[PDB]
Scaffold this motif. Structure first.
Motif, PDB file in Angstrom:
ATOM      1  N   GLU B 112       0.816  -1.209   0.000  1.00 53.06           N
ATOM      2  CA  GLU B 112       0.000   0.000   0.000  1.00 53.06           C
ATOM      3  C   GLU B 112       0.853   1.263   0.000  1.00 53.06           C
ATOM      4  OE1 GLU B 112      -3.031   0.153   2.953  1.00 53.06           O
ATOM      5  OE2 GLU B 112      -4.055  -1.649   2.230  1.00 53.06           O
ATOM      6  N   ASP B 113       1.993   1.240   0.686  1.00 55.08           N
ATOM      7  CA  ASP B 113       2.883   2.390   0.801  1.00 55.08           C
ATOM      8  C   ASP B 113       4.167   2.083   0.040  1.00 55.08           C
ATOM      9  OD1 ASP B 113       0.858   3.165   2.581  1.00 55.08           O
ATOM     10  OD2 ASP B 113       1.971   2.391   4.307  1.00 55.08           O
ATOM     11  N   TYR B 114       4.535   2.966  -0.894  1.00 57.16           N
ATOM     12  CA  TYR B 114       5.586   2.654  -1.861  1.00 57.16           C
ATOM     13  C   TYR B 114       6.682   3.707  -1.981  1.00 57.16           C
ATOM     14  CZ  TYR B 114       2.085   5.446  -4.356  1.00 57.16           C
ATOM     15  OH  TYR B 114       1.170   6.412  -4.709  1.00 57.16           O
ATOM     16  N   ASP B 115       6.348   4.996  -1.885  1.00 59.27           N
ATOM     17  CA  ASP B 115       7.292   6.037  -2.296  1.00 59.27           C
ATOM     18  C   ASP B 115       8.463   6.192  -1.328  1.00 59.27           C
ATOM     19  OD1 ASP B 115       5.654   7.036  -0.261  1.00 59.27           O
ATOM     20  OD2 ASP B 115       5.800   9.098  -0.991  1.00 59.27           O
ATOM     21  N   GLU B 116       8.235   5.956  -0.034  1.00 59.56           N
ATOM     22  CA  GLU B 116       9.244   6.285   0.971  1.00 59.56           C
ATOM     23  C   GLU B 116      10.511   5.459   0.790  1.00 59.56           C
ATOM     24  OE1 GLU B 116       7.549   5.927   4.843  1.00 59.56           O
ATOM     25  OE2 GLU B 116       6.303   7.724   4.649  1.00 59.56           O
ATOM     26  N   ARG B 117      10.370   4.175   0.463  1.00 58.08           N
ATOM     27  CA  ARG B 117      11.540   3.310   0.367  1.00 58.08           C
ATOM     28  C   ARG B 117      12.474   3.733  -0.761  1.00 58.08           C
ATOM     29  NH1 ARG B 117      11.971  -2.874   2.299  1.00 58.08           N
ATOM     30  NH2 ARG B 117      10.400  -2.853   3.965  1.00 58.08           N
ATOM     31  N   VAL B 118      11.933   4.301  -1.838  1.00 55.34           N
ATOM     32  CA  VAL B 118      12.687   4.528  -3.060  1.00 55.34           C
ATOM     33  C   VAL B 118      13.161   5.971  -3.184  1.00 55.34           C
ATOM     34  CG1 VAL B 118      12.551   4.573  -5.570  1.00 55.34           C
ATOM     35  CG2 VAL B 118      11.649   2.612  -4.312  1.00 55.34           C
ATOM     36  N   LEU B 119      12.333   6.948  -2.802  1.00 61.89           N
ATOM     37  CA  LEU B 119      12.707   8.340  -3.057  1.00 61.89           C
ATOM     38  C   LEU B 119      14.067   8.689  -2.465  1.00 61.89           C
ATOM     39  CD1 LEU B 119       9.222  10.031  -2.875  1.00 61.89           C
ATOM     40  CD2 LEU B 119      10.937  10.476  -4.642  1.00 61.89           C
ATOM     41  N   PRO B 120      14.288   8.578  -1.149  1.00 57.42           N
ATOM     42  CA  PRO B 120      15.633   8.867  -0.625  1.00 57.42           C
ATOM     43  C   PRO B 120      16.702   8.010  -1.266  1.00 57.42           C
ATOM     44  CG  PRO B 120      14.053   8.528   1.159  1.00 57.42           C
ATOM     45  CD  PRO B 120      13.384   8.088  -0.097  1.00 57.42           C
ATOM     46  N   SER B 121      16.399   6.745  -1.546  1.00 57.40           N
ATOM     47  CA  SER B 121      17.377   5.825  -2.111  1.00 57.40           C
ATOM     48  C   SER B 121      18.007   6.380  -3.382  1.00 57.40           C
ATOM     49  CB  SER B 121      16.680   4.492  -2.404  1.00 57.40           C
ATOM     50  OG  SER B 121      17.517   3.584  -3.085  1.00 57.40           O
ATOM     51  N   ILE B 122      17.202   6.484  -4.438  1.00 57.92           N
ATOM     52  CA  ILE B 122      17.737   6.900  -5.726  1.00 57.92           C
ATOM     53  C   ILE B 122      18.152   8.361  -5.684  1.00 57.92           C
ATOM     54  CG2 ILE B 122      16.524   5.135  -7.030  1.00 57.92           C
ATOM     55  CD1 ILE B 122      14.447   7.323  -7.756  1.00 57.92           C
ATOM     56  N   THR B 123      17.389   9.207  -4.986  1.00 61.72           N
ATOM     57  CA  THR B 123      17.722  10.626  -4.996  1.00 61.72           C
ATOM     58  C   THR B 123      19.071  10.877  -4.330  1.00 61.72           C
ATOM     59  OG1 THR B 123      15.372  11.190  -4.974  1.00 61.72           O
ATOM     60  CG2 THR B 123      16.943  12.920  -4.413  1.00 61.72           C
ATOM     61  N   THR B 124      19.316  10.252  -3.174  1.00 65.26           N
ATOM     62  CA  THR B 124      20.610  10.385  -2.521  1.00 65.26           C
ATOM     63  C   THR B 124      21.716   9.789  -3.375  1.00 65.26           C
ATOM     64  OG1 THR B 124      19.779  10.498  -0.249  1.00 65.26           O
ATOM     65  CG2 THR B 124      21.989   9.587  -0.574  1.00 65.26           C
ATOM     66  N   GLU B 125      21.473   8.623  -3.982  1.00 63.46           N
ATOM     67  CA  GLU B 125      22.497   8.042  -4.842  1.00 63.46           C
ATOM     68  C   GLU B 125      22.894   9.012  -5.948  1.00 63.46           C
ATOM     69  OE1 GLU B 125      21.440   4.721  -7.203  1.00 63.46           O
ATOM     70  OE2 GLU B 125      23.509   4.031  -7.447  1.00 63.46           O
ATOM     71  N   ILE B 126      21.904   9.555  -6.659  1.00 64.58           N
ATOM     72  CA  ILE B 126      22.206  10.392  -7.813  1.00 64.58           C
ATOM     73  C   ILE B 126      22.807  11.716  -7.368  1.00 64.58           C
ATOM     74  CG2 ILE B 126      20.436   9.269  -9.198  1.00 64.58           C
ATOM     75  CD1 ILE B 126      18.715  11.777  -8.799  1.00 64.58           C
ATOM     76  N   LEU B 127      22.316  12.285  -6.265  1.00 59.44           N
ATOM     77  CA  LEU B 127      22.898  13.525  -5.765  1.00 59.44           C
ATOM     78  C   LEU B 127      24.358  13.321  -5.398  1.00 59.44           C
ATOM     79  CD1 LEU B 127      20.044  14.676  -5.839  1.00 59.44           C
ATOM     80  CD2 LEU B 127      20.481  15.701  -3.610  1.00 59.44           C
ATOM     81  N   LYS B 128      24.656  12.247  -4.664  1.00 56.50           N
ATOM     82  CA  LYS B 128      26.042  11.984  -4.310  1.00 56.50           C
ATOM     83  C   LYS B 128      26.896  11.814  -5.556  1.00 56.50           C
ATOM     84  CE  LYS B 128      25.966  11.236   0.412  1.00 56.50           C
ATOM     85  NZ  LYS B 128      26.909  10.943   1.525  1.00 56.50           N
ATOM     86  N   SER B 129      26.448  10.991  -6.505  1.00 52.53           N
ATOM     87  CA  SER B 129      27.251  10.754  -7.701  1.00 52.53           C
ATOM     88  C   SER B 129      27.466  12.045  -8.487  1.00 52.53           C
ATOM     89  CB  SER B 129      26.581   9.697  -8.578  1.00 52.53           C
ATOM     90  OG  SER B 129      26.514   8.451  -7.907  1.00 52.53           O
ATOM     91  N   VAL B 130      26.382  12.755  -8.803  1.00 49.58           N
ATOM     92  CA  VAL B 130      26.479  13.926  -9.669  1.00 49.58           C
ATOM     93  C   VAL B 130      27.316  15.011  -9.008  1.00 49.58           C
ATOM     94  CG1 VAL B 130      24.288  14.856  -8.800  1.00 49.58           C
ATOM     95  CG2 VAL B 130      25.180  15.613 -11.004  1.00 49.58           C
ATOM     96  N   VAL B 131      27.052  15.303  -7.733  1.00 50.25           N
ATOM     97  CA  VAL B 131      27.781  16.378  -7.075  1.00 50.25           C
ATOM     98  C   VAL B 131      29.235  15.986  -6.885  1.00 50.25           C
ATOM     99  CG1 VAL B 131      27.978  17.696  -4.949  1.00 50.25           C
ATOM    100  CG2 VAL B 131      25.741  17.341  -6.031  1.00 50.25           C
ATOM    101  N   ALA B 132      29.487  14.767  -6.402  1.00 52.36           N
ATOM    102  CA  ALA B 132      30.829  14.210  -6.424  1.00 52.36           C
ATOM    103  C   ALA B 132      31.516  14.526  -7.745  1.00 52.36           C
ATOM    104  CB  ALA B 132      30.740  12.701  -6.182  1.00 52.36           C
ATOM    105  N   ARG B 133      30.804  14.336  -8.856  1.00 58.92           N
ATOM    106  CA  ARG B 133      31.380  14.659 -10.156  1.00 58.92           C
ATOM    107  C   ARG B 133      31.628  16.155 -10.318  1.00 58.92           C
ATOM    108  NH1 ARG B 133      28.004  11.253 -14.671  1.00 58.92           N
ATOM    109  NH2 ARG B 133      26.602  10.964 -12.883  1.00 58.92           N
TER     110      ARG B 133
END
Lengths: 75, 136
Positions: B112-133
């Protein structure tokens, strides 16, 4: 406790000859019904269950989706 | 004759009340932009999304999952290292909505509840990667 059950069983009226046969048939039907209910492992949405078995350990070739899939009772 | 008529009327009223209760228990409100799914047990969860409409079901097998196919924002803070490796605390704003079509898979896979598990996951991953770059 058992004495109360015995008294209740004795208190049942001695109906006609066919009453006993009808009661036996109804009891058999109810037994079949509960066997059917607990012979289908109640898995929920999206899940699965192959036969975790106690005969032949656990089989490997038979694969089951979620839904109409019969357990053997308690087995 | 009157007593029999009254008894029949009472029996019919009781039957009508039972039928109405059964019918009521088989439906769930679908607030516009709500696309439910069937969560049964003899099949688990079906393959067909419930539109933004009132669609029927049977009792004790389905627990009305009144989803919401509307949009939603989210803020993801990430303590990322950049190219020059700074402590960039980046709170990104993200808008997202689900799709009406394949909601039953969405319910089976997660629930029933879906967004919480994924939003921080991918968003933090991409923010770390891109900004690291990228330099601070």
């Amino acid at each position: 406790m058992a004495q109360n059950l015995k008294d209740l069983a004795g208190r049942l009226p001695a109906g006609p000859r066919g009453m006993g046969t009808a009661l036996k048939l109804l009891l058999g039907a109810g037994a079949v019904a509960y066997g059917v209910r607990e012979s289908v492992f109640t898995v929920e949405g999206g899940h699965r269950a192959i036969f975790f078995n106690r005969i032949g350990g656990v089989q490997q070739d038979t694969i089951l989706a979620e839904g109409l899939h019969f357990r053997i009772p308690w087995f | 004759m009157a007593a029999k008529v009254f008894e029949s009327i009472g029996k019919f009223g009781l039957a009508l009340a039972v039928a109405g209760g059964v019918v009521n228990s088989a439906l769930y409100n679908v607030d516009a932009g709500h696309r439910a799914v069937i969560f049964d047990r003899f099949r688990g969860v079906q393959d067909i999304v419930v539109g933004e409409g009132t669609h029927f079901l049977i009792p004790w097998v389905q627990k009305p999952i009144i989803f919401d196919c509307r949009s939603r924002p989210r803020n993801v803070p990430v303590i990322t290292g950049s190219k020059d490796l700074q402590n960039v605390n980046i709170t990104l704003r993200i808008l997202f909505r689900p799709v009406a079509s394949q909601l039953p898979r969405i319910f089976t896979s997660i629930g029933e509840d879906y967004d919480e598990r994924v939003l921080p996951s991918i968003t933090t991953e991409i923010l770390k990667s891109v900004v690291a770059r990228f330099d601070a």
